[PDB]
Amino acid sequence: ASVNQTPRTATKETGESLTINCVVTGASCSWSRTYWYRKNPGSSNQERISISGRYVESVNKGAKSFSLRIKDLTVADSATYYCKALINTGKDCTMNFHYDGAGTVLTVNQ
Amino acid sequence: NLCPFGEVFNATRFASVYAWNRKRISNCVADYSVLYNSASFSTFKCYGVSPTKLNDLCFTNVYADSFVIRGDEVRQIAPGQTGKIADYNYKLPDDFTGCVIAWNSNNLDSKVGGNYNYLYRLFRKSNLKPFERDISTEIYQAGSTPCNGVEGFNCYFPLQSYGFQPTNGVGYQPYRVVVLSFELLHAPATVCGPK
Ligand SMILES: *[C@@H]1O[C@H](CO)[C@@H](O)[C@H](O)[C@H]1NC(C)=O
Ligand SMILES: [Cl-]
């Protein structure tokens, strides 16, 4: 059905870190993480987030969740962050579509 | 009783080509004349069967694959084609028996500022076999050095967004595609036409 992404909004000072969690919801079928991405204010572009260095990700099939962690936050990290998953659906779990979380609006100050 | 072809063509959502969908059609009657007598398709090509004769034919099973690609890639959805789509996303066999149908879907699948929700695979260690599907997301090692799951030079994420913009010319616009496979095996037929 859907992906529940938390937190929906966030404010942090420079140096802190942000953790985002995405829970696959209303699914009796399997799913997989596709990627995370950001939209910068005033732009429609989706910038995929490459996982390395200060971007750490994890996946927890037991809890039907996947997460992203961002360390050493800077002002330019202010953006809305999204999680994308590929989810099987339908009676026999025979179809698949991509679903996005509703996003985390990150504001970074100082 | 009546095959659910409406659900395939009319579906509000379509798959990304790399994660293409397949619907098995069986134990039902199919009136294909509704398709071929429709002028809303930009491509309608059959291989090994004449579409007008479908309404008087029976098959063991029918399969309906669906996905979105750009207009100038529809050419790759044919037997014996090469290209990123044919090689790395959706491959028909050389002896394909079925029909390829497509139409411009700019008015559903384009978005102002760009629709990034349709993806394709850009790299792969080897070509797909016919009707193989690959939904993996491993970093692609394009040079000699192992990537160890980290992106960088010659270490590439293998999926890429189309980014369909309404201001794009028609070759770059999204096309919805339906591939019908007609399977004939030594078994009772379960998909027949109205005759
Ligand atoms: C899609 O739905 C409309 C509903 O009015 C129907 O007339 C049409 O035949 C359907 N398309 C197909 C391919 O069955
Ligand atoms: Cl994490």
Side-chain angles (χ1 to χ4, degrees), chain A residues 32-35 44-46 48 50-52 84 86 94-100, chain B residues 13-16 18-22 113 116-117 119 135 137 149-151 157 159:
Chain A
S32 47
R33 177 273 287 122
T34 318
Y35 53 85
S44 59
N45 173 237
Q46 292 183 11
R48 192 179 43 80
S50 73
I51 301 303
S52 56
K84 184 185 297 296
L86 179 66
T94 58
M95 298 284 283
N96 67 357
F97 296 97
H98 300 275
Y99 295 79
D100 291 351
Chain B
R13 293 175 295 165
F14 264 46
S16 286
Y18 89 89
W20 50 273
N21 280 319
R22 162 161 292 191
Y116 300 91
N117 313 324
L119 298 168
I135 60 165
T137 63
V150 177
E151 284 177 72
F157 195 70
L159 310 179

mmCIF file of all heavy atoms in Angstrom, chain A residues 32-35 44-46 48 50-52 84 86 94-100, chain B residues 13-16 18-22 113 116-117 119 135 137 149-151 157 159:
data_model
loop_
_atom_site.group_PDB
_atom_site.id
_atom_site.type_symbol
_atom_site.label_atom_id
_atom_site.label_comp_id
_atom_site.label_asym_id
_atom_site.label_seq_id
_atom_site.Cartn_x
_atom_site.Cartn_y
_atom_site.Cartn_z
ATOM 1 N N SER A 32 11.579 -4.131 -1.646
ATOM 2 C CA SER A 32 13.016 -3.867 -1.607
ATOM 3 C C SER A 32 13.276 -2.367 -1.620
ATOM 4 O O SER A 32 12.476 -1.590 -2.148
ATOM 5 C CB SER A 32 13.805 -4.493 -2.769
ATOM 6 O OG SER A 32 13.247 -4.280 -4.040
ATOM 7 N N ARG A 33 14.384 -1.961 -1.016
ATOM 8 C CA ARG A 33 14.770 -0.555 -1.059
ATOM 9 C C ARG A 33 15.246 -0.233 -2.471
ATOM 10 O O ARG A 33 15.997 -1.001 -3.070
ATOM 11 C CB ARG A 33 15.862 -0.319 -0.017
ATOM 12 C CG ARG A 33 16.418 1.079 0.020
ATOM 13 C CD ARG A 33 17.594 1.301 -0.973
ATOM 14 N NE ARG A 33 18.836 0.658 -0.548
ATOM 15 C CZ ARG A 33 19.505 -0.242 -1.259
ATOM 16 N NH1 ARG A 33 19.036 -0.701 -2.411
ATOM 17 N NH2 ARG A 33 20.687 -0.676 -0.812
ATOM 18 N N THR A 34 14.828 0.897 -3.026
ATOM 19 C CA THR A 34 15.374 1.321 -4.309
ATOM 20 C C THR A 34 16.485 2.357 -4.118
ATOM 21 O O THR A 34 17.648 2.112 -4.459
ATOM 22 C CB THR A 34 14.238 1.849 -5.193
ATOM 23 O OG1 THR A 34 13.118 0.969 -5.049
ATOM 24 C CG2 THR A 34 14.630 1.919 -6.656
ATOM 25 N N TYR A 35 16.150 3.494 -3.533
ATOM 26 C CA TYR A 35 17.150 4.488 -3.199
ATOM 27 C C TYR A 35 16.496 5.565 -2.370
ATOM 28 O O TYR A 35 15.277 5.596 -2.220
ATOM 29 C CB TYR A 35 17.813 5.110 -4.438
ATOM 30 C CG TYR A 35 16.977 5.696 -5.523
ATOM 31 C CD1 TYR A 35 16.516 7.001 -5.450
ATOM 32 C CD2 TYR A 35 16.754 5.012 -6.697
ATOM 33 C CE1 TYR A 35 15.803 7.575 -6.500
ATOM 34 C CE2 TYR A 35 16.021 5.584 -7.739
ATOM 35 C CZ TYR A 35 15.551 6.864 -7.623
ATOM 36 O OH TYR A 35 14.856 7.451 -8.659
ATOM 37 N N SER A 44 12.798 21.345 -8.731
ATOM 38 C CA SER A 44 12.060 20.104 -8.917
ATOM 39 C C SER A 44 12.976 18.902 -9.097
ATOM 40 O O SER A 44 12.488 17.781 -9.182
ATOM 41 C CB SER A 44 11.150 20.225 -10.146
ATOM 42 O OG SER A 44 11.932 20.506 -11.296
ATOM 43 N N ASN A 45 14.285 19.109 -9.175
ATOM 44 C CA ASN A 45 15.189 18.004 -9.446
ATOM 45 C C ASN A 45 15.245 17.039 -8.268
ATOM 46 O O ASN A 45 15.233 17.439 -7.105
ATOM 47 C CB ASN A 45 16.583 18.532 -9.756
ATOM 48 C CG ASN A 45 17.599 17.423 -9.884
ATOM 49 O OD1 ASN A 45 18.613 17.403 -9.180
ATOM 50 N ND2 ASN A 45 17.318 16.469 -10.772
ATOM 51 N N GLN A 46 15.309 15.755 -8.570
ATOM 52 C CA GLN A 46 15.509 14.736 -7.550
ATOM 53 C C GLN A 46 16.965 14.281 -7.594
ATOM 54 O O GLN A 46 17.438 13.784 -8.616
ATOM 55 C CB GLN A 46 14.534 13.584 -7.761
ATOM 56 C CG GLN A 46 13.097 14.036 -7.480
ATOM 57 C CD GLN A 46 12.109 12.916 -7.594
ATOM 58 O OE1 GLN A 46 12.499 11.758 -7.685
ATOM 59 N NE2 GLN A 46 10.833 13.247 -7.616
ATOM 60 N N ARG A 48 19.518 11.816 -6.294
ATOM 61 C CA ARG A 48 19.701 10.563 -5.573
ATOM 62 C C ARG A 48 20.856 10.740 -4.600
ATOM 63 O O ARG A 48 21.831 11.436 -4.879
ATOM 64 C CB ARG A 48 19.971 9.389 -6.516
ATOM 65 C CG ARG A 48 19.877 8.014 -5.825
ATOM 66 C CD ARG A 48 20.123 6.859 -6.790
ATOM 67 N NE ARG A 48 21.244 7.162 -7.669
ATOM 68 C CZ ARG A 48 22.524 7.035 -7.341
ATOM 69 N NH1 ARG A 48 22.905 6.531 -6.166
ATOM 70 N NH2 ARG A 48 23.449 7.421 -8.207
ATOM 71 N N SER A 50 23.926 9.185 -2.799
ATOM 72 C CA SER A 50 24.872 8.076 -2.826
ATOM 73 C C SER A 50 25.258 7.738 -1.396
ATOM 74 O O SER A 50 25.593 8.627 -0.607
ATOM 75 C CB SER A 50 26.120 8.401 -3.661
ATOM 76 O OG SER A 50 26.950 9.311 -2.988
ATOM 77 N N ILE A 51 25.219 6.450 -1.066
ATOM 78 C CA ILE A 51 25.438 6.003 0.300
ATOM 79 C C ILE A 51 26.929 5.785 0.480
ATOM 80 O O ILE A 51 27.508 4.838 -0.057
ATOM 81 C CB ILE A 51 24.653 4.726 0.613
ATOM 82 C CG1 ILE A 51 23.156 4.945 0.407
ATOM 83 C CG2 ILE A 51 24.908 4.345 2.046
ATOM 84 C CD1 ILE A 51 22.585 6.085 1.244
ATOM 85 N N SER A 52 27.546 6.669 1.243
ATOM 86 C CA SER A 52 28.960 6.559 1.544
ATOM 87 C C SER A 52 29.285 7.674 2.521
ATOM 88 O O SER A 52 28.547 8.656 2.633
ATOM 89 C CB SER A 52 29.811 6.660 0.289
ATOM 90 O OG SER A 52 29.528 7.866 -0.390
ATOM 91 N N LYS A 84 12.493 5.685 -1.459
ATOM 92 C CA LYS A 84 11.764 4.982 -2.505
ATOM 93 C C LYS A 84 11.948 3.470 -2.350
ATOM 94 O O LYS A 84 13.064 2.983 -2.156
ATOM 95 C CB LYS A 84 12.234 5.358 -3.890
ATOM 96 C CG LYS A 84 11.459 4.752 -5.034
ATOM 97 C CD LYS A 84 12.091 5.087 -6.431
ATOM 98 C CE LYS A 84 12.101 6.597 -6.775
ATOM 99 N NZ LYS A 84 10.702 7.091 -6.894
ATOM 100 N N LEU A 86 10.445 -0.507 -3.881
ATOM 101 C CA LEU A 86 9.765 -1.261 -4.926
ATOM 102 C C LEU A 86 8.964 -2.328 -4.209
ATOM 103 O O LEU A 86 9.548 -3.193 -3.553
ATOM 104 C CB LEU A 86 10.733 -1.902 -5.902
ATOM 105 C CG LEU A 86 10.128 -2.733 -7.041
ATOM 106 C CD1 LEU A 86 9.331 -1.858 -7.999
ATOM 107 C CD2 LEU A 86 11.211 -3.490 -7.808
ATOM 108 N N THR A 94 1.917 -10.530 -7.404
ATOM 109 C CA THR A 94 2.531 -10.712 -8.715
ATOM 110 C C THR A 94 2.826 -9.413 -9.453
ATOM 111 O O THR A 94 3.373 -9.460 -10.565
ATOM 112 C CB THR A 94 1.650 -11.585 -9.616
ATOM 113 O OG1 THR A 94 0.359 -10.971 -9.749
ATOM 114 C CG2 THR A 94 1.512 -12.986 -9.051
ATOM 115 N N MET A 95 2.478 -8.258 -8.907
ATOM 116 C CA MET A 95 2.740 -7.001 -9.602
ATOM 117 C C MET A 95 3.707 -6.199 -8.749
ATOM 118 O O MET A 95 3.849 -6.465 -7.553
ATOM 119 C CB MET A 95 1.441 -6.245 -9.842
ATOM 120 C CG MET A 95 0.477 -7.010 -10.731
ATOM 121 S SD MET A 95 0.891 -7.023 -12.516
ATOM 122 C CE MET A 95 0.388 -5.374 -13.072
ATOM 123 N N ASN A 96 4.428 -5.247 -9.346
ATOM 124 C CA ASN A 96 5.241 -4.383 -8.493
ATOM 125 C C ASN A 96 5.202 -2.946 -8.982
ATOM 126 O O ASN A 96 5.025 -2.670 -10.169
ATOM 127 C CB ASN A 96 6.690 -4.919 -8.297
ATOM 128 C CG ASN A 96 7.548 -4.916 -9.551
ATOM 129 O OD1 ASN A 96 7.132 -4.578 -10.639
ATOM 130 N ND2 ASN A 96 8.777 -5.289 -9.368
ATOM 131 N N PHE A 97 5.292 -2.034 -8.019
ATOM 132 C CA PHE A 97 5.353 -0.617 -8.308
ATOM 133 C C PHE A 97 6.269 0.041 -7.308
ATOM 134 O O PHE A 97 6.429 -0.443 -6.197
ATOM 135 C CB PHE A 97 3.977 0.053 -8.223
ATOM 136 C CG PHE A 97 3.029 -0.456 -9.224
ATOM 137 C CD1 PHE A 97 2.114 -1.430 -8.893
ATOM 138 C CD2 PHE A 97 3.085 -0.008 -10.518
ATOM 139 C CE1 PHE A 97 1.235 -1.913 -9.841
ATOM 140 C CE2 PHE A 97 2.209 -0.482 -11.452
ATOM 141 C CZ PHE A 97 1.291 -1.434 -11.117
ATOM 142 N N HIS A 98 6.781 1.209 -7.671
ATOM 143 C CA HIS A 98 7.549 2.005 -6.734
ATOM 144 C C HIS A 98 6.626 2.895 -5.903
ATOM 145 O O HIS A 98 5.622 3.431 -6.391
ATOM 146 C CB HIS A 98 8.589 2.873 -7.447
ATOM 147 C CG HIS A 98 9.592 2.107 -8.248
ATOM 148 N ND1 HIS A 98 10.742 1.570 -7.698
ATOM 149 C CD2 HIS A 98 9.621 1.797 -9.563
ATOM 150 C CE1 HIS A 98 11.464 1.004 -8.657
ATOM 151 N NE2 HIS A 98 10.788 1.088 -9.786
ATOM 152 N N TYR A 99 7.001 3.062 -4.637
ATOM 153 C CA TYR A 99 6.281 3.895 -3.683
ATOM 154 C C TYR A 99 7.273 4.757 -2.942
ATOM 155 O O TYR A 99 8.325 4.288 -2.544
ATOM 156 C CB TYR A 99 5.537 3.057 -2.672
ATOM 157 C CG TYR A 99 4.445 2.222 -3.269
ATOM 158 C CD1 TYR A 99 4.736 1.040 -3.923
ATOM 159 C CD2 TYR A 99 3.107 2.599 -3.163
ATOM 160 C CE1 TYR A 99 3.743 0.254 -4.465
ATOM 161 C CE2 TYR A 99 2.108 1.810 -3.707
ATOM 162 C CZ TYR A 99 2.437 0.639 -4.351
ATOM 163 O OH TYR A 99 1.486 -0.157 -4.911
ATOM 164 N N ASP A 100 6.932 6.010 -2.728
ATOM 165 C CA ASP A 100 7.799 6.926 -2.000
ATOM 166 C C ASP A 100 7.202 7.229 -0.630
ATOM 167 O O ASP A 100 5.980 7.343 -0.477
ATOM 168 C CB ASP A 100 7.988 8.235 -2.769
ATOM 169 C CG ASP A 100 8.811 8.074 -4.027
ATOM 170 O OD1 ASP A 100 9.384 7.008 -4.231
ATOM 171 O OD2 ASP A 100 8.931 9.031 -4.807
ATOM 172 N N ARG B 13 -1.570 2.962 -13.086
ATOM 173 C CA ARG B 13 -0.120 2.883 -12.909
ATOM 174 C C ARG B 13 0.494 1.895 -13.887
ATOM 175 O O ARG B 13 -0.106 0.857 -14.193
ATOM 176 C CB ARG B 13 0.250 2.475 -11.482
ATOM 177 C CG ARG B 13 -0.092 3.517 -10.418
ATOM 178 C CD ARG B 13 0.201 2.991 -9.010
ATOM 179 N NE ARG B 13 -0.662 1.867 -8.675
ATOM 180 C CZ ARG B 13 -0.455 1.042 -7.659
ATOM 181 N NH1 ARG B 13 0.615 1.152 -6.891
ATOM 182 N NH2 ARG B 13 -1.349 0.093 -7.404
ATOM 183 N N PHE B 14 1.676 2.233 -14.391
ATOM 184 C CA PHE B 14 2.482 1.330 -15.194
ATOM 185 C C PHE B 14 3.844 1.197 -14.534
ATOM 186 O O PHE B 14 4.289 2.096 -13.814
ATOM 187 C CB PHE B 14 2.712 1.799 -16.687
ATOM 188 C CG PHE B 14 1.732 1.177 -17.667
ATOM 189 C CD1 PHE B 14 0.375 1.148 -17.364
ATOM 190 C CD2 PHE B 14 2.154 0.659 -18.873
ATOM 191 C CE1 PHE B 14 -0.534 0.597 -18.245
ATOM 192 C CE2 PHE B 14 1.251 0.065 -19.742
ATOM 193 C CZ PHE B 14 -0.098 0.062 -19.431
ATOM 194 N N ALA B 15 4.479 0.049 -14.780
ATOM 195 C CA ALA B 15 5.773 -0.244 -14.218
ATOM 196 C C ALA B 15 6.892 0.494 -14.921
ATOM 197 O O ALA B 15 6.814 0.779 -16.121
ATOM 198 C CB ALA B 15 6.064 -1.742 -14.349
ATOM 199 N N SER B 16 7.981 0.709 -14.186
ATOM 200 C CA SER B 16 9.271 0.976 -14.823
ATOM 201 C C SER B 16 9.730 -0.228 -15.630
ATOM 202 O O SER B 16 9.516 -1.391 -15.252
ATOM 203 C CB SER B 16 10.355 1.287 -13.798
ATOM 204 O OG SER B 16 10.219 2.565 -13.252
ATOM 205 N N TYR B 18 12.557 -1.578 -16.090
ATOM 206 C CA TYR B 18 13.515 -2.506 -15.478
ATOM 207 C C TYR B 18 12.808 -3.443 -14.513
ATOM 208 O O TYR B 18 13.280 -4.556 -14.250
ATOM 209 C CB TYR B 18 14.610 -1.751 -14.738
ATOM 210 C CG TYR B 18 14.347 -1.417 -13.260
ATOM 211 C CD1 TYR B 18 14.697 -2.324 -12.213
ATOM 212 C CD2 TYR B 18 13.822 -0.171 -12.893
ATOM 213 C CE1 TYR B 18 14.529 -1.996 -10.918
ATOM 214 C CE2 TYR B 18 13.636 0.168 -11.599
ATOM 215 C CZ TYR B 18 13.931 -0.784 -10.582
ATOM 216 O OH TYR B 18 13.715 -0.417 -9.282
ATOM 217 N N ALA B 19 11.697 -2.976 -13.955
ATOM 218 C CA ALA B 19 10.835 -3.710 -13.035
ATOM 219 C C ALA B 19 9.512 -4.031 -13.699
ATOM 220 O O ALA B 19 8.436 -3.905 -13.098
ATOM 221 C CB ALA B 19 10.576 -2.902 -11.775
ATOM 222 N N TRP B 20 9.594 -4.465 -14.944
ATOM 223 C CA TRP B 20 8.403 -4.613 -15.763
ATOM 224 C C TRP B 20 7.441 -5.605 -15.129
ATOM 225 O O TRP B 20 7.840 -6.518 -14.386
ATOM 226 C CB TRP B 20 8.797 -5.044 -17.173
ATOM 227 C CG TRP B 20 9.720 -6.215 -17.343
ATOM 228 C CD1 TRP B 20 11.093 -6.205 -17.342
ATOM 229 C CD2 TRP B 20 9.336 -7.570 -17.576
ATOM 230 N NE1 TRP B 20 11.579 -7.482 -17.562
ATOM 231 C CE2 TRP B 20 10.517 -8.325 -17.726
ATOM 232 C CE3 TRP B 20 8.102 -8.221 -17.695
ATOM 233 C CZ2 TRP B 20 10.490 -9.669 -17.984
ATOM 234 C CZ3 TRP B 20 8.090 -9.556 -17.945
ATOM 235 C CH2 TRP B 20 9.271 -10.275 -18.067
ATOM 236 N N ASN B 21 6.148 -5.397 -15.401
ATOM 237 C CA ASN B 21 5.113 -6.263 -14.854
ATOM 238 C C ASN B 21 4.657 -7.270 -15.904
ATOM 239 O O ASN B 21 4.750 -7.038 -17.112
ATOM 240 C CB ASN B 21 3.890 -5.480 -14.353
ATOM 241 C CG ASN B 21 4.091 -4.880 -12.997
ATOM 242 O OD1 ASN B 21 4.653 -5.508 -12.106
ATOM 243 N ND2 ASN B 21 3.581 -3.662 -12.804
ATOM 244 N N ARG B 22 4.136 -8.400 -15.409
ATOM 245 C CA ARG B 22 3.580 -9.460 -16.219
ATOM 246 C C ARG B 22 2.261 -9.887 -15.583
ATOM 247 O O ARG B 22 2.200 -10.119 -14.373
ATOM 248 C CB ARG B 22 4.523 -10.673 -16.286
ATOM 249 C CG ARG B 22 3.823 -11.934 -16.747
ATOM 250 C CD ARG B 22 4.817 -12.989 -17.245
ATOM 251 N NE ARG B 22 5.454 -12.552 -18.488
ATOM 252 C CZ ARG B 22 6.193 -13.334 -19.260
ATOM 253 N NH1 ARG B 22 6.444 -14.598 -18.925
ATOM 254 N NH2 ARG B 22 6.682 -12.843 -20.394
ATOM 255 N N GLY B 113 8.359 20.195 -14.512
ATOM 256 C CA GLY B 113 9.519 19.979 -13.679
ATOM 257 C C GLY B 113 10.073 18.574 -13.745
ATOM 258 O O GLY B 113 11.122 18.303 -13.144
ATOM 259 N N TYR B 116 10.231 11.820 -12.298
ATOM 260 C CA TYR B 116 11.407 10.985 -12.082
ATOM 261 C C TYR B 116 11.055 9.595 -11.589
ATOM 262 O O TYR B 116 11.954 8.856 -11.204
ATOM 263 C CB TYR B 116 12.357 11.634 -11.073
ATOM 264 C CG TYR B 116 12.859 13.003 -11.517
ATOM 265 C CD1 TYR B 116 12.181 14.151 -11.170
ATOM 266 C CD2 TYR B 116 14.014 13.123 -12.275
ATOM 267 C CE1 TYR B 116 12.638 15.422 -11.596
ATOM 268 C CE2 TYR B 116 14.484 14.359 -12.691
ATOM 269 C CZ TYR B 116 13.790 15.508 -12.353
ATOM 270 O OH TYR B 116 14.261 16.725 -12.776
ATOM 271 N N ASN B 117 9.776 9.228 -11.599
ATOM 272 C CA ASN B 117 9.317 7.976 -11.020
ATOM 273 C C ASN B 117 9.444 6.797 -11.983
ATOM 274 O O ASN B 117 9.142 5.672 -11.590
ATOM 275 C CB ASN B 117 7.854 8.107 -10.537
ATOM 276 C CG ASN B 117 7.585 9.402 -9.714
ATOM 277 O OD1 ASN B 117 8.423 9.884 -8.938
ATOM 278 N ND2 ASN B 117 6.387 9.946 -9.890
ATOM 279 N N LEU B 119 12.104 4.488 -14.225
ATOM 280 C CA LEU B 119 13.517 4.159 -14.147
ATOM 281 C C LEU B 119 13.891 3.177 -15.225
ATOM 282 O O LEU B 119 13.072 2.351 -15.641
ATOM 283 C CB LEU B 119 13.844 3.517 -12.759
ATOM 284 C CG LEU B 119 13.576 4.444 -11.594
ATOM 285 C CD1 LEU B 119 13.613 3.710 -10.265
ATOM 286 C CD2 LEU B 119 14.620 5.591 -11.557
ATOM 287 N N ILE B 135 15.875 -6.721 -11.046
ATOM 288 C CA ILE B 135 15.524 -5.606 -10.171
ATOM 289 C C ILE B 135 16.631 -5.322 -9.165
ATOM 290 O O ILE B 135 16.405 -4.627 -8.191
ATOM 291 C CB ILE B 135 14.169 -5.814 -9.457
ATOM 292 C CG1 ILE B 135 14.206 -7.096 -8.583
ATOM 293 C CG2 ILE B 135 13.085 -5.832 -10.496
ATOM 294 C CD1 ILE B 135 13.065 -7.175 -7.568
ATOM 295 N N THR B 137 20.012 -3.720 -7.342
ATOM 296 C CA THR B 137 20.540 -2.366 -7.190
ATOM 297 C C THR B 137 22.007 -2.374 -6.725
ATOM 298 O O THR B 137 22.424 -1.536 -5.917
ATOM 299 C CB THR B 137 19.715 -1.540 -6.201
ATOM 300 O OG1 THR B 137 19.783 -2.138 -4.895
ATOM 301 C CG2 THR B 137 18.266 -1.475 -6.564
ATOM 302 N N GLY B 149 30.714 -1.912 -2.886
ATOM 303 C CA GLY B 149 29.442 -1.268 -2.621
ATOM 304 C C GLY B 149 29.478 0.237 -2.456
ATOM 305 O O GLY B 149 28.526 0.818 -1.926
ATOM 306 N N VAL B 150 30.547 0.893 -2.908
ATOM 307 C CA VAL B 150 30.679 2.342 -2.835
ATOM 308 C C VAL B 150 30.700 2.919 -4.240
ATOM 309 O O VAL B 150 31.435 2.429 -5.103
ATOM 310 C CB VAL B 150 31.950 2.749 -2.070
ATOM 311 C CG1 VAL B 150 32.119 4.279 -2.052
ATOM 312 C CG2 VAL B 150 31.914 2.182 -0.672
ATOM 313 N N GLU B 151 29.921 3.978 -4.451
ATOM 314 C CA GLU B 151 29.945 4.700 -5.711
ATOM 315 C C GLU B 151 31.183 5.573 -5.851
ATOM 316 O O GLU B 151 31.770 6.039 -4.875
ATOM 317 C CB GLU B 151 28.764 5.642 -5.840
ATOM 318 C CG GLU B 151 27.492 5.024 -6.147
ATOM 319 C CD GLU B 151 26.405 6.073 -6.171
ATOM 320 O OE1 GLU B 151 26.373 6.882 -7.124
ATOM 321 O OE2 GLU B 151 25.609 6.102 -5.222
ATOM 322 N N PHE B 157 25.921 3.489 -9.704
ATOM 323 C CA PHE B 157 24.568 3.046 -9.452
ATOM 324 C C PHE B 157 23.931 2.657 -10.782
ATOM 325 O O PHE B 157 24.046 3.400 -11.757
ATOM 326 C CB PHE B 157 23.740 4.131 -8.782
ATOM 327 C CG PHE B 157 22.450 3.587 -8.175
ATOM 328 C CD1 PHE B 157 22.477 2.767 -7.054
ATOM 329 C CD2 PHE B 157 21.234 3.872 -8.760
ATOM 330 C CE1 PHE B 157 21.288 2.275 -6.525
ATOM 331 C CE2 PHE B 157 20.060 3.387 -8.228
ATOM 332 C CZ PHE B 157 20.086 2.577 -7.153
ATOM 333 N N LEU B 159 20.692 2.159 -11.916
ATOM 334 C CA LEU B 159 19.403 2.678 -12.368
ATOM 335 C C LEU B 159 19.480 4.188 -12.597
ATOM 336 O O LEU B 159 20.234 4.903 -11.943
ATOM 337 C CB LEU B 159 18.279 2.359 -11.365
ATOM 338 C CG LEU B 159 18.221 0.883 -10.926
ATOM 339 C CD1 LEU B 159 17.116 0.696 -9.930
ATOM 340 C CD2 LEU B 159 18.058 -0.022 -12.139
#
